mmCIF file of C-alpha atoms and ligand atoms in Angstrom:
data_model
loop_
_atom_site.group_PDB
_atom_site.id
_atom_site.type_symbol
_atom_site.label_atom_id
_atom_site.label_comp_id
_atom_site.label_asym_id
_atom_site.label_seq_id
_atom_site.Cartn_x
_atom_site.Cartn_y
_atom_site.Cartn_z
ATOM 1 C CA UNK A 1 -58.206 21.701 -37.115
ATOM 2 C CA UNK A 2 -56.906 18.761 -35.003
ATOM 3 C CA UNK A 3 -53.290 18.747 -33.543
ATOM 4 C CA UNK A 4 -51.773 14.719 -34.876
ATOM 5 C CA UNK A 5 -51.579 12.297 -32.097
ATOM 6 C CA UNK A 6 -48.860 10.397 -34.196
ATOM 7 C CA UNK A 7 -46.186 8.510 -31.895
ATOM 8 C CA UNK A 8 -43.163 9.614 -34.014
ATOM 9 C CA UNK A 9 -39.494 9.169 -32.779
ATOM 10 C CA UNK A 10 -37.532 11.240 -35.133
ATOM 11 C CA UNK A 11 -33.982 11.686 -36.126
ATOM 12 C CA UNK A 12 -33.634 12.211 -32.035
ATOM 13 C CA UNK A 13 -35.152 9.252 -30.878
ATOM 14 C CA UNK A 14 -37.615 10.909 -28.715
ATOM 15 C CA UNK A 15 -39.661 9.141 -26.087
ATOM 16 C CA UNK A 16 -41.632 9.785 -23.016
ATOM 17 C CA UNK A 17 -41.029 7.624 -19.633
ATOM 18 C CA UNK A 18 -42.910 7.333 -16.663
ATOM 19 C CA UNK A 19 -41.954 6.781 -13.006
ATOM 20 C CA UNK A 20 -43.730 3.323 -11.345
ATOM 21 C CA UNK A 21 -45.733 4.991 -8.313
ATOM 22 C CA UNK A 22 -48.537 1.959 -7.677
ATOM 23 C CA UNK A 23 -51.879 2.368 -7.091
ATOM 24 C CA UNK A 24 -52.392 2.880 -3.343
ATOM 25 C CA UNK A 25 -55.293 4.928 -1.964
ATOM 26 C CA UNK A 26 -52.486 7.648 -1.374
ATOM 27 C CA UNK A 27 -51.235 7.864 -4.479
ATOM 28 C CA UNK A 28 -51.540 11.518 -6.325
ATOM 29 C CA UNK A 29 -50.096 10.694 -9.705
ATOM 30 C CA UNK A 30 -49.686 7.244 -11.408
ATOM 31 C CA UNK A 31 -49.460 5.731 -14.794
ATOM 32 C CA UNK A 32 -50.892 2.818 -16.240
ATOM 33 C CA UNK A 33 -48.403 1.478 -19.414
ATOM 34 C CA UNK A 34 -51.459 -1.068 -20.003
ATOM 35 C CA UNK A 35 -53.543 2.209 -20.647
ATOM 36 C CA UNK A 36 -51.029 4.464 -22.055
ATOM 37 C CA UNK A 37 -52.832 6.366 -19.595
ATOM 38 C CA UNK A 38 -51.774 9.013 -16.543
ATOM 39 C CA UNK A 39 -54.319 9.151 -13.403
ATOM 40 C CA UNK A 40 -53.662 12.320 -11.591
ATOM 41 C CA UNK A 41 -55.286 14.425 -8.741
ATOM 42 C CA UNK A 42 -56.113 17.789 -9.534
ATOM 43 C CA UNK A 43 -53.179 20.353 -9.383
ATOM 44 C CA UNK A 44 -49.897 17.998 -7.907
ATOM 45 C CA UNK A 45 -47.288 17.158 -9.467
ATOM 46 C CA UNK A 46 -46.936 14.947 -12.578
ATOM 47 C CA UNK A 47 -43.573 13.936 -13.374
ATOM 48 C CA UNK A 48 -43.114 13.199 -17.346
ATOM 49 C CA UNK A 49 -38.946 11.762 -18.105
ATOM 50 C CA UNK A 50 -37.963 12.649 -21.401
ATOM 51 C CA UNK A 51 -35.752 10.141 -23.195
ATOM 52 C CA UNK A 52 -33.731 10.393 -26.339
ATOM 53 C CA UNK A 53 -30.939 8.527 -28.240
ATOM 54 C CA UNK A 54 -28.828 11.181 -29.095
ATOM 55 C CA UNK A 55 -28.718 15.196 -28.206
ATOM 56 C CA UNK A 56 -30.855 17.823 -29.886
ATOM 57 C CA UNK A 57 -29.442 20.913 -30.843
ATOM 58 C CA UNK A 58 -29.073 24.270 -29.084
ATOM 59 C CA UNK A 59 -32.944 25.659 -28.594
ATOM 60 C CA UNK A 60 -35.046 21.877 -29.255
ATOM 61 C CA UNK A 61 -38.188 22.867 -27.301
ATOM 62 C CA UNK A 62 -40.622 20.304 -25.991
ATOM 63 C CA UNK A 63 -44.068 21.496 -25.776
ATOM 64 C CA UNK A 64 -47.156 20.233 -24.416
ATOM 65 C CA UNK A 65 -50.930 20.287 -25.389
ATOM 66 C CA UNK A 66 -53.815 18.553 -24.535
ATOM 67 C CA UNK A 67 -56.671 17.577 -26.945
ATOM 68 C CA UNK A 68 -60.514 15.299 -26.199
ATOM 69 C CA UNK A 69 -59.439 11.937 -27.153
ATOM 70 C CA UNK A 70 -63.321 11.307 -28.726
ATOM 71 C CA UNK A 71 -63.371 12.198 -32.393
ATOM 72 C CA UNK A 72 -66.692 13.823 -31.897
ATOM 73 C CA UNK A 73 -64.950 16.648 -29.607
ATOM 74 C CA UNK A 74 -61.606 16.733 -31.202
ATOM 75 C CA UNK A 75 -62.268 19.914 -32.583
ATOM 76 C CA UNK A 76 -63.103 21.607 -29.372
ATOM 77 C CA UNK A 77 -60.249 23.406 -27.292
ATOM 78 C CA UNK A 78 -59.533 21.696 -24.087
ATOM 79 C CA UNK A 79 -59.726 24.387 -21.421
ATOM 80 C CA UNK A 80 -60.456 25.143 -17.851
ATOM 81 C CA UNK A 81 -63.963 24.964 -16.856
ATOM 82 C CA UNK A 82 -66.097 28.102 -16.175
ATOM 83 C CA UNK A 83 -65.160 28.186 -12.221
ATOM 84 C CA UNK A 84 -61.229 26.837 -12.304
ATOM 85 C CA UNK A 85 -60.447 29.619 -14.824
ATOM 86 C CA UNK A 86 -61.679 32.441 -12.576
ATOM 87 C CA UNK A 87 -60.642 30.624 -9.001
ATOM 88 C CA UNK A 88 -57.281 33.103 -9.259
ATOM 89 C CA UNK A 89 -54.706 30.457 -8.342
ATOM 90 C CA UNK A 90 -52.079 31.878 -10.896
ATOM 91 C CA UNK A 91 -48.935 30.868 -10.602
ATOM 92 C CA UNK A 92 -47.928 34.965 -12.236
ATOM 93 C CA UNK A 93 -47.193 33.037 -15.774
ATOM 94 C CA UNK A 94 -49.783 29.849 -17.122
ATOM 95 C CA UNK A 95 -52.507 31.912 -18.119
ATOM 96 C CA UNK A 96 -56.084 31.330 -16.026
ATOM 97 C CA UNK A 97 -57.579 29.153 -18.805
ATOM 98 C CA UNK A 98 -54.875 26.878 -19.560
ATOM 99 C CA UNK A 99 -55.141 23.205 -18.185
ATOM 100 C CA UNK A 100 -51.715 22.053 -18.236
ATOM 101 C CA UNK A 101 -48.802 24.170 -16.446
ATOM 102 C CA UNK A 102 -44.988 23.387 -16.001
ATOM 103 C CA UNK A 103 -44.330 23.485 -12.545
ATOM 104 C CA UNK A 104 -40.572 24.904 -11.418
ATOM 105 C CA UNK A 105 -39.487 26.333 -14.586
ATOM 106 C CA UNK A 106 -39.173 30.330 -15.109
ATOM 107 C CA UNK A 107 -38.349 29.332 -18.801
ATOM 108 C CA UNK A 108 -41.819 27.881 -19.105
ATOM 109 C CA UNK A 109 -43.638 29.523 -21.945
ATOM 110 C CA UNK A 110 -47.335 29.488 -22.411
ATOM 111 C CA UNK A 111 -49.216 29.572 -26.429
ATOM 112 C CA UNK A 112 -52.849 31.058 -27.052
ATOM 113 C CA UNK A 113 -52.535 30.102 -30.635
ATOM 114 C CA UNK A 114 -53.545 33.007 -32.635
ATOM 115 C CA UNK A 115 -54.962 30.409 -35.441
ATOM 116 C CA UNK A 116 -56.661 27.810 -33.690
ATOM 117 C CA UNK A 117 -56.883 29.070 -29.850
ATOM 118 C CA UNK A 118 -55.081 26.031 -28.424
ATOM 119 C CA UNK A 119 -53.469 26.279 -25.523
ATOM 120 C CA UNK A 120 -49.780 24.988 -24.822
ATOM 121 C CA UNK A 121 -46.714 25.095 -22.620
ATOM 122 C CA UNK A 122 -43.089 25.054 -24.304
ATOM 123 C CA UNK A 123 -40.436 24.587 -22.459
ATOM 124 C CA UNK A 124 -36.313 24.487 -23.611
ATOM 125 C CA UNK A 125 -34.791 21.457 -23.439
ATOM 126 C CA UNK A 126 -31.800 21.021 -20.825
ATOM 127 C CA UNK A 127 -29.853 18.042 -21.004
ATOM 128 C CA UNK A 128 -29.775 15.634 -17.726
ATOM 129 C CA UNK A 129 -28.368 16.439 -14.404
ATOM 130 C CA UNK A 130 -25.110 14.955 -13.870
ATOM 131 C CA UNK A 131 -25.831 11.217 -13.162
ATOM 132 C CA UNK A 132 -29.509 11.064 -14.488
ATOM 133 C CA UNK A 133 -29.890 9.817 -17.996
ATOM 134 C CA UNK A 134 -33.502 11.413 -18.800
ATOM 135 C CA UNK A 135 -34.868 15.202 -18.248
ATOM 136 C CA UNK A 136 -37.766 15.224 -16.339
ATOM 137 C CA UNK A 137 -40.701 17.998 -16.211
ATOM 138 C CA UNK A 138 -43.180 18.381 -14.123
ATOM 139 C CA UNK A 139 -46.665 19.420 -15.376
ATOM 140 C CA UNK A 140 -49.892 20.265 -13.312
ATOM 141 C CA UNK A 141 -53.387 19.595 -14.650
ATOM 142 C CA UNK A 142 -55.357 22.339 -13.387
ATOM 143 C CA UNK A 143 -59.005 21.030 -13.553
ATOM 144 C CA UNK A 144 -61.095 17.817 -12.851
ATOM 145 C CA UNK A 145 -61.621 14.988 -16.211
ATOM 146 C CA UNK A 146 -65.349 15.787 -14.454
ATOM 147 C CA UNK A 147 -65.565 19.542 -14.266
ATOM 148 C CA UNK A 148 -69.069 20.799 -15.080
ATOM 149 C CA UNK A 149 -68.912 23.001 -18.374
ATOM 150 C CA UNK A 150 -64.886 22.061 -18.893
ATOM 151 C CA UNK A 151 -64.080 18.548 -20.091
ATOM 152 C CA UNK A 152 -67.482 17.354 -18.362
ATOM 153 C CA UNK A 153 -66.075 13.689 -18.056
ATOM 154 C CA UNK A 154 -64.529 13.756 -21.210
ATOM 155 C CA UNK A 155 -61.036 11.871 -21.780
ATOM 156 C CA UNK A 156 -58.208 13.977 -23.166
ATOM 157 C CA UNK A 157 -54.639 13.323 -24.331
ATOM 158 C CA UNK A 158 -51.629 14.657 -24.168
ATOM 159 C CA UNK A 159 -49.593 15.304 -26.879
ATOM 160 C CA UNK A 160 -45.988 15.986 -26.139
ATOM 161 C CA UNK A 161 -43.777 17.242 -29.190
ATOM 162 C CA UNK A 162 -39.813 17.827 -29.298
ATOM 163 C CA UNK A 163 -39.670 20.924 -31.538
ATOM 164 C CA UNK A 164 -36.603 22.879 -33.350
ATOM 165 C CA UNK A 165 -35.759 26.343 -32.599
ATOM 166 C CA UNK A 166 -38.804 27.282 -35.265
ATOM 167 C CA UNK A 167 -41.205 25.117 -33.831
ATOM 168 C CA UNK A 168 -40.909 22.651 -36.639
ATOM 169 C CA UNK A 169 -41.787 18.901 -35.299
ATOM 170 C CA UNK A 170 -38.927 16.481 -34.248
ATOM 171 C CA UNK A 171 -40.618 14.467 -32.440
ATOM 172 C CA UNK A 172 -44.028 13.142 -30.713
ATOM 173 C CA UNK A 173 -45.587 11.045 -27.943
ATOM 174 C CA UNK A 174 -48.556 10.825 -26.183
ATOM 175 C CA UNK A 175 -50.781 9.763 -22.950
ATOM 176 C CA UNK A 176 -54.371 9.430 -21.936
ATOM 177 C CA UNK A 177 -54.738 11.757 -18.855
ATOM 178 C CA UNK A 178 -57.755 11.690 -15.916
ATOM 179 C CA UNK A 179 -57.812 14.201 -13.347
ATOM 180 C CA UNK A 180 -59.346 12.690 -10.391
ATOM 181 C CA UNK A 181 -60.000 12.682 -6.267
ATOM 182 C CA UNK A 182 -58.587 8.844 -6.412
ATOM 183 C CA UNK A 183 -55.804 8.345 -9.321
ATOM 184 C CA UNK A 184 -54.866 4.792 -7.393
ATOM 185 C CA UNK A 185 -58.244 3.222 -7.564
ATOM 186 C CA UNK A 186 -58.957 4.760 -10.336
ATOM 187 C CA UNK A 187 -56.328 3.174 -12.165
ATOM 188 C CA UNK A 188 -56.931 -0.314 -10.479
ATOM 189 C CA UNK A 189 -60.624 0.396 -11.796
ATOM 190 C CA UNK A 190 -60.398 0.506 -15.464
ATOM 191 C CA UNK A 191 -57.159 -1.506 -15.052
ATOM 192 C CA UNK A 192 -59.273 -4.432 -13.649
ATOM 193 C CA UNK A 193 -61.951 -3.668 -17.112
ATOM 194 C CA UNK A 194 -59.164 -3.868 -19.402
ATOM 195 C CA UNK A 195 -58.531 -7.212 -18.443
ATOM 196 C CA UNK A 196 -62.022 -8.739 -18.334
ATOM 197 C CA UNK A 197 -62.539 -6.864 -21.726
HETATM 198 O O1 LIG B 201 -27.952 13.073 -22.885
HETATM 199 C C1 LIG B 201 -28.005 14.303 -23.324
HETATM 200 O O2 LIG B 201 -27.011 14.950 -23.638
HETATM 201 C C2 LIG B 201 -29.371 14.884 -23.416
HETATM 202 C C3 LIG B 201 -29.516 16.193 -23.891
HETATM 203 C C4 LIG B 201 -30.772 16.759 -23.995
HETATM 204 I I1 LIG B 201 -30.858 18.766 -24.697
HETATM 205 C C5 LIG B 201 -31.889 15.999 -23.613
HETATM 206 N N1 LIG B 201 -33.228 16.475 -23.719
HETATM 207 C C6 LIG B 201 -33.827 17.349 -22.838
HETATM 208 C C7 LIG B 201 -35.132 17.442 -23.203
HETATM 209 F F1 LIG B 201 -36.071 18.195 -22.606
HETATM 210 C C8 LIG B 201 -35.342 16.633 -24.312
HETATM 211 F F2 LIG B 201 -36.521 16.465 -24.945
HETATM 212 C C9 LIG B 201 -34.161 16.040 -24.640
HETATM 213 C C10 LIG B 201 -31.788 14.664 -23.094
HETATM 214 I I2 LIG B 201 -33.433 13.546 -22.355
HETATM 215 C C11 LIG B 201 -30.500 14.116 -23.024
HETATM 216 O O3 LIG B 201 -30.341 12.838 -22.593
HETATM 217 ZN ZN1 LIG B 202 -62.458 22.867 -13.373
#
């Protein structure tokens, strides 16, 4: 089984936005819209805006879940690697294995699906603070793209879906994430081989 990577606005209008934090040596989270692609040091916080057209109803969720971009390992659960899920840095609610946590939100809920042991994060949607026109959440990736016997230099997505009060899709988006000591070079990096590709 393989969770559909299909960009998919919906009824909604659903759509993902990213802030514009550059690519300085400093940086600890950054995305690169050339990439669809999110370049992140390892547990900080990753800001993901949440834009739609028009209002969901009472109890849209948005969830979260991250699958290996490479057909060859789409099949295989993205999890944390043998050390990161025993290093006891629980927050008291994502569970030790999962990679991706909401940061900030007791509402936060976290899936082991019984079916196809995926991991997610759900999370009810809340409309805007008054004079913001997006929702932001903020997500954690809690192991390295490189982590020996976890992804192991793989490249994952994420795969954000707006979902009713049954977990029936509205929506979908998604982003290339790397977890990495240097998100700003990094990005200028493969950036800089986009371009002379
Ligand atoms: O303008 C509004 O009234 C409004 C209401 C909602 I509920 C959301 N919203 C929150 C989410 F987490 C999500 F996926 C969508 C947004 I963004 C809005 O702009
Ligand atoms: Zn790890």
């Amino acid at each position: 089984s393989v969770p559909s990577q299909k960009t998919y606005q919906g009824s909604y209008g659903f759509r993902l936005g990213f802030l514009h934090s550059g690519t300085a040596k400093s940086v600890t989270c950054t995305y690169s819209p050339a990439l669809n692609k999110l370049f992140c040091q390892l547990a900080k916080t990753c800001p993901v805006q949440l834009w739609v057209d028009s209002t969901p109803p009472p109890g849209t969720r948005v969830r979260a879940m991250a699958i290996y971009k490479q057909s060859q390992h789409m099949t295989e659960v993205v999890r944390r690697c043998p050390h990161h899920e025993r290093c006891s840095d629980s927050d008291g609610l994502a569970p030790p294995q999962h990679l991706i946590r909401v940061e900030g939100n007791l509402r936060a809920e976290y899936l082991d699906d019984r079916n196809t042991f995926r991991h997610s994060v759900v999370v009810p949607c809340e409309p805007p603070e008054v004079g913001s026109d997006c929702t932001t959440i903020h997500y954690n990736y809690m192991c390295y793209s490189s982590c020996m016997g976890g992804m192991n230099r793989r490249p994952i997505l994420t795969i954000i879906t707006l979902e009713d009060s049954s977990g029936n899709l509205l929506g979908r988006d998604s982003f290339e994430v790397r977890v990495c000591a240097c998100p700003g070079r990094d990005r200028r990096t493969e950036e800089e081989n986009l371009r002379k590709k």
